[PDB]
Amino acid sequence: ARIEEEELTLTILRLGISIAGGKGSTPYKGDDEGIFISRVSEEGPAARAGVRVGDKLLEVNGVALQGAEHHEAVEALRTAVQMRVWRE
C-alpha cells in the first residue's frame, strides 16, 4: 500500500541531471555524503528513463560509486549509461 524505499536499475540512453555531494563535499542530504541527483531537466534523457531528484547514485556502468569522491561520480557519468540508484 506504500513504498518506504527501493533500489532501481535504470538505464538511460543519450544526460540532463546534476549530481551533488560526494565524500569531501558538503552533503546534499543532512548526513549523507553520497552522490545524489539534485536537478533533473524535465525534457532530458534521464527524466524519461525514470531518474528522479533525490535518488542516491550507487553504481554507474558497473563501477561502484557507493561512498566515492565527487569527481569519481562525475567521471563515471561524463552515448549510453546505466545507473543503479537507491530511493527514499
Binding site: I17, I19, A20, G22, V74, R78
Partner: peptide, 5 residues
C-alpha cells in the same frame, strides 16, 4: 556542489 552532467 551541483555539477552538470
Amino acid at each position: 556542489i551541483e555539477s552538470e552532467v
